[PDB]
Write a protein that binds this DNA or RNA. Structure first.
Ligand SMILES: [Mg+2]
Ligand SMILES: [Mg+2]
Ligand SMILES: [Mg+2]
Ligand SMILES: [Mg+2]
Ligand SMILES: [Zn+2]
Ligand SMILES: [Zn+2]
Ligand SMILES: [Zn+2]
Ligand SMILES: [Zn+2]
Lengths: 97, 193, 261, 241, 115, 185
RNA sequence: GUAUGUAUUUAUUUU
RNA sequence: GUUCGCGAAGUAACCCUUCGUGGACAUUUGGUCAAUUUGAAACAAUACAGAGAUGAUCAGCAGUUCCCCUGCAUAAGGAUGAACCGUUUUACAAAGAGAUUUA
RNA sequence: GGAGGUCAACAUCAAGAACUGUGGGCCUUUGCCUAUAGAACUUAUAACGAACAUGGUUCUUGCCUUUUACCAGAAC
């Protein structure tokens, strides 16, 4: 069966929102006071006993924002959980080939 | 911050390089505020970084257009009168300072020494009697209820006699052409065409 | 108490007296961003501290005491602090109470309020590791005494004992005659850090003996972090201590675990 | 701070913002020490500012005069061509200078009329307007450059650095796509096993067949499976066309 | 820092002839300036044959090599130089002479010429 | 996204007795003291007025793998230094569970990115002359004991300790495992 | 378009 | 410290001053950071070396890398930027002939 | 409560010669037709600015060893 209709109006919705989150996440990153025009306590820690409140700090505009971002190279591991079986279905041939 | 060798400046040094991005802006805002000949010393509002990283001149110069033309043209006449007058006119040498002399601190040398009066003009007592008083003020009209908005200084309004005198003084800079028909093949559309 | 507790801390050095910055002519021209010198490399730059502390004489109450701050002034550990009673940090030798206060935060960071790094350092440099509690200071460059030859090693041993002995409770001391090094070991990590920062680049013998007034020309003695002890004896001794202490905290584990049920 | 931070202590700035070496430089110095148009451009620009602010200073000191001042900053704003050297690092500024000279001519012959050839002058409105607007131009431009210069100065240059095809490296890429495209086919015709030895070998046969096509030599191989010869004939026909 | 550089910043005092005197005194104490020797990159005009590994410097080969002002002076006054070149295969130094009277070179110590 | 979304890991201990706490969140902080990669940083103050400031050191990952506290760097449950808990665990079983860690750089910079966990984590002038001394006890113990009952040198190769009080009169006082005897000139 | 590269340990890690 | 007010005292004739007290106004800054040796700039100098394809002397483009540097740069340079130029054995069989041991 | 401020935030500023709300009818909300109320700022030799800069891509040129930097026109 082809995937109905009201099924795609879902995947399109959630995917669209997610991509917007990535894009807007990026446009606020880089160096342009220009590029920003195209754009909650939330923490129950442990048992929530002490709660939390999270608040951002405004950076001194001159000083570097993202004090820790520094270009460096990394080799990533490949964590192999499971094996994908590779399942397929000469003699005189070499004299040809 | 003139002398800093200390470790305590590890941030301020980082702070300097950052401001290096915003300097040419500060050069603009500084340079459009030049005091002009008839004024002695302009006084500006600077916005500085608390660590002394850089100093912005925060304003934009506003001048009444007819008044500004009057002022500048008055200076024009004074220029001509003075070029005709004195025999030896001496153009100052460039650059003003030699490379080894550090820039002299304003809080010592300059602030004590008095302005040494500017251009202005003799004007006239009788003819200009309306406009002789405030013509050369830094901001020409600040306190008036009728003549100007207020200290925010936008939306000038005048009377007839004043505009008569301003119209009189600005003759050397005035457009002088009284009719449209004078421009025949010189308007824009003849240039585009 | 009668000594330190009552009598307020006194200014070690007048602010105008503090040494200048800009270390001298290690190179050709001075450099503004880094504070170093520019081209070439002069003979390696090290010098004895003009300064030293006097534990009962200088140390006294300060503002951190009333403010209840945890961490100690290192410019006091260097005896160089110019803020006197106005100082933000405590002036006195670490005791067992105060380490009692620090005990929760002594794991990540030293007693002076600086984060520890992981790897120690190539040469066993300034600050240690947060992986391994290291209570043993390597004392080296005993030529901080300059060239005076001494009747026996009891001169070196005795003198050092009377030096670090002030700075905190010493678990053991071994000077080595063959290769010039002391190995000094304290009850507490805190006293080890404080002593390290305190006695680095220092001189020796009496307030006046012999060449004393020339002392400032000396090199000064390295105080660095010490490796383990290779001999089997102390290695047994460590293994045992770790054993019994692990045993001791298993008591806590079963007390709060028993409370867990 | 930006000069020393880079590690160059032998380039001295004077107080007129001239940047001069204090030594004769070994080659690796000249390589480390090449400063771009960001720095140098901004250097020239400040040099202009310092220059004007100085003229007004010497007015304030009483050392000059009233009128000599106005003539002074007129002389600056016209002669920035000669007094600065900004025209080196962006040659576009040559428009303004042309403009700033033309106004000069205009202003004089409506001014010196009836009196004098001498230096007396000092109507500086128009030139001021021109240099000012030019400075409006490069605010975002220098923010972009110096933005990269400094963020690169703290954070290091990007590690990826992919590089596009242009006029110089084109042919190399064309070669590369070709040899790849033949690798695929002649790997997919063969029945199973052999790869790397026959890889290198077959691609060599490619190169040889091309050279022999330049030389008009027919390039018969004493033996070789015919379908491979079909393929190589195909691709070398392509490259030929 | 341009390769073609018109000016060089000098200290604000710098009596130049005084620096010529003090630097003239300084010139004796240094190791490099006084080496009596020299280093030059050059070619071999006449080719070569090595006398150690019998390696052949085939015709004209770049070398980093060493020029020396010879105590001889051709005729009454002409300069004459002696160059040395290390062999690629073995560590061996071969020398030249430049005859101003007979334009071609003549060589010694560690190499022979092909005919 | 990836760096923010995992929430921090903090002990209840060092986080203080305050009911509601305000903490700062910086999207790029210093690197770990361990992995040497950027992360998101959190200030806070235990007390409202407390002078001291708490700064999470390590990552969320570099923590989770080791199952410790980002401010303390103590085990998440037992409040134990890492090099200990794996020793207790290693006492059970026989020889295992030591955490082998990451020398160089991209050894560690690599290692922090795998999800494997780590072994501890996986489960969760009067001279008295002194003799007869065990090599083991520290000088600190001795003098403390004397003080409790009512200045010192030891040699540990020797097993011999000398003691000078500030007055023989103390000598009489204390005279109110050892070989004592009282002699000096 | 005036290469480039290697080495430059002084201050002594417990048997 | 201001203001509203109450009470007491004093001047006073409900006002002026002092005293005591009630109420309102005003309400928690700052730190990722402590001031030279021991938590990390980089060149230079000295010694040795001495240049890609080749018999040789040069133009160069690329390609791979957990090397990067100058550059605003997705341009272009940095010796064609550098490193590369070396170490190298098992999906292993089939047939035949000779020597030794064994139901 | 009035006057202001070289104070801030949030709206709006290039289009069917063009805005918004509301009443009524038809289709079945949209949309069409009809009725009514209010429309600040900017526009006809067309535009917020009675002024006037720079950058990117793509083409055409101009210098002309090559790249930045450029020469002068166009479109986006
Ligand atoms: Mg290249
Ligand atoms: Mg070459
Ligand atoms: Mg290459
Ligand atoms: Mg090229
Ligand atoms: Zn202090
Ligand atoms: Zn040879
Ligand atoms: Zn981490
Ligand atoms: Zn904690």
């Amino acid at each position: 069966p082809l995937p109905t209709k009201a099924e795609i109006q879902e995947c399109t919705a959630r995917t669209k929102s997610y991509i917007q989150r990535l894009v807007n996440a990026k446009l606020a990153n880089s160096n342009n006071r220009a590029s920003s025009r195209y754009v909650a306590p939330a923490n129950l820690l442990l048992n929530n006993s002490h709660h939390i409140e999270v608040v951002s700090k405004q950076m001194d505009p001159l000083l570097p924002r993202f004090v820790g971002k520094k270009a460096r190279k990394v080799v990533a591991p490949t964590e192999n959980d499971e094996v994908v079986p590779v399942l397929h279905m000469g003699e005189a041939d070499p004299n040809e080939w | 911050h003139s002398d800093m060798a200390s470790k305590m400046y590890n941030t301020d040094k980082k702070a300097f390089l950052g401001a290096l991005k915003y300097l040419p802006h500060a050069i603009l805002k500084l340079l459009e505020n030049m005091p002009h000949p008839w004024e002695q010393a302009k006084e500006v509002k600077v916005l500085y970084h608390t660590s002394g990283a850089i100093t912005f001149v925060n304003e934009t110069p506003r001048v009444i257009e007819p008044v500004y033309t009057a002022q500048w043209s008055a200076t024009w006449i004074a220029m001509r009168r003075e070029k005709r007058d004195r025999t030896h006119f001496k153009r100052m040498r460039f650059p003003p300072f030699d490379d080894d002399e550090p820039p002299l601190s304003y809080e010592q040398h300059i602030e004590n020494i008095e302005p040494l009066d500017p251009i202005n003009l003799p004007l006239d007592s009788q003819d200009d009697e309306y406009v002789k008083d405030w013509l050369y003020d830094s901001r020409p009209l600040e306190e008036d209820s009728k003549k100007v908005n207020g200290t925010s200084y936008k939306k000038w309004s005048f009377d007839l006699p004043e505009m008569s005198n301003l119209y009189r003084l600005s003759t050397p800079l005035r457009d002088e052409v009284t009719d449209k028909n004078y421009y025949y093949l010189f308007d824009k559309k003849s240039f585009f065409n | 108490m009668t000594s330190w507790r009552d009598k307020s801390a006194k200014v070690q050095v007048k602010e105008s007296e503090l040494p200048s910055s800009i270390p001298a002519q290690t190179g050709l021209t001075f450099n503004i961003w880094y504070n170093k010198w520019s081209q070439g490399f002069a003979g390696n730059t090290r010098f004895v501290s003009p300064f030293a502390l006097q534990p009962q004489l200088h140390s006294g109450k300060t503002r951190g005491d009333n403010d209840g701050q945890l961490f100690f002034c290192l410019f006091f550990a260097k005896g160089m602090c110019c803020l006197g009673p106005k100082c933000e940090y405590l002036h006195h030798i670490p005791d067992e109470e105060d380490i009692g206060k620090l005990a929760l935060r002594t794991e990540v960071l030293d007693c002076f309020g600086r984060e520890k790094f992981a790897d120690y350092r190539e040469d066993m440099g300034g600050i240690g590791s947060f992986r391994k509690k290291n209570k043993t200071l390597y004392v080296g460059g005993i030529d901080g005494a300059l060239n005076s030859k001494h009747l026996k090693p009891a001169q070196i041993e005795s003198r050092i004992r009377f030096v670090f002995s002030r700075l905190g409770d010493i678990d053991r001391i071994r000077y080595v005659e063959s290769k010039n090094c002391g190995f000094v070991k304290f009850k507490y990590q805190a006293n080890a850090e404080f002593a390290k920062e305190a006695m680095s680049n220092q001189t020796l013998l009496l307030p006046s003996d012999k060449e004393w007034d020339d002392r400032r020309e000396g090199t000064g003695l390295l105080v660095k972090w010490a490796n383990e002890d290779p001999d089997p004896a102390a290695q047994k001794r460590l293994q045992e201590e770790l054993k019994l202490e692990s045993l001791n905290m298993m008591v806590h584990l079963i007390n709060n675990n028993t409370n867990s049920a | 701070l930006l000069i020393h931070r880079k590690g160059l202590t032998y380039l001295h700035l004077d107080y007129n913002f001239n940047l001069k070496p204090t030594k004769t430089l070994t080659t690796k110095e000249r390589k480390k020490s090449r400063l771009g148009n960001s720095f140098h451009l901004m250097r020239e620009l400040l040099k202009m500012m310092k220059l004007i602010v100085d003229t007004h200073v010497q007015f304030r000191l009483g050392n000059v005069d009233a009128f000599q001042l106005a003539d002074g900053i007129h002389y600056i704003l016209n002669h920035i061509g000669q007094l600065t050297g900004i025209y080196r690092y962006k040659y576009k500024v040559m428009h303004q200078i042309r403009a700033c000279k033309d106004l000069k001519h205009i202003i004089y012959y409506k001014f010196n009329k009836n009196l004098g050839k001498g230096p007396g002058c000092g109507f500086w409105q128009p030139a001021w307007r021109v240099w000012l607007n030019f400075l409006r131009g490069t605010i975002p431009l220098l923010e972009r450059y110096i933005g990269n210069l400094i963020t690169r100065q703290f954070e290091g240059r990007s590690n990826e650095i992919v590089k596009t095809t242009t006029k110089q490296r084109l042919d190399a890429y064309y070669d590369l796509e070709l040899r790849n495209s033949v690798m695929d086919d002649i790997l997919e015709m063969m029945p199973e096993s052999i790869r790397q030895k026959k890889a290198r070998t077959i691609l060599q046969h490619l190169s040889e067949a091309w050279r022999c096509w330049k030389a008009n030599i027919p390039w018969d191989v004493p033996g070789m499976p015919a379908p491979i010869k079909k393929i190589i004939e195909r691709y070398i026909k392509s490259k030929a066309d | 820092s341009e390769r073609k550089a018109i000016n060089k910043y000098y200290p604000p005092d710098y009596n130049p002839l005084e620096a010529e005197k003090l630097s003239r005194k300084m010139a004796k104490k240094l190791k490099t300036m006084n080496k009596s020797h020299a280093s030059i990159r050059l070619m071999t005009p006449f080719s070569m044959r090595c006398l150690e590994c019998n390696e052949y410097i085939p015709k004209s080969r770049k070398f980093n090599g060493k020029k020396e002002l010879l105590k001889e002076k051709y005729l009454d006054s002409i300069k004459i130089y002696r160059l040395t070149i290390s062999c690629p295969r073995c560590a061996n130094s071969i020398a030249f002479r430049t005859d101003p009277g007979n334009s071609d070179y003549v060589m010694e110590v560690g190499g022979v010429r092909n005919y | 996204d990836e760096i923010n979304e995992p929430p921090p890991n903090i002990c209840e201990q060092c986080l203080g007795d305050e009911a509601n706490i305000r903490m700062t969140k910086i999207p790029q902080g210093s690197e770990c003291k361990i992995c040497t990669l950027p992360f998101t940083l959190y200030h806070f103050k235990t007390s409202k007025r407390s002078n001291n400031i708490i700064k999470t050191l390590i990552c969320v990952r570099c923590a989770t793998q080791r199952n410790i506290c980002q401010c303390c760097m103590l085990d998440s449950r037992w409040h134990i230094p890492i090099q200990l808990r794996d020793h207790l665990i290693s006492l059970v079983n026989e020889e295992n569970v030591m955490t082998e860690e990451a020398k160089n750089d991209m050894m560690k910079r690599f290692l922090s990115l795998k999800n494997v966990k780590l072994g501890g984590a996986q489960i969760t002038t009067k001279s008295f002359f002194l003799y007869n001394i065990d090599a083991s006890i520290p000088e600190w113990k001795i003098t403390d004991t004397v003080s409790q009952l009512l200045s010192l040198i030891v040699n540990h190769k020797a097993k011999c300790g000398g003691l000078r009080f500030q007055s023989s009169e103390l000598g009489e006082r204390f005279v109110s495992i050892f070989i004592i005897p009282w002699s000096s000139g």
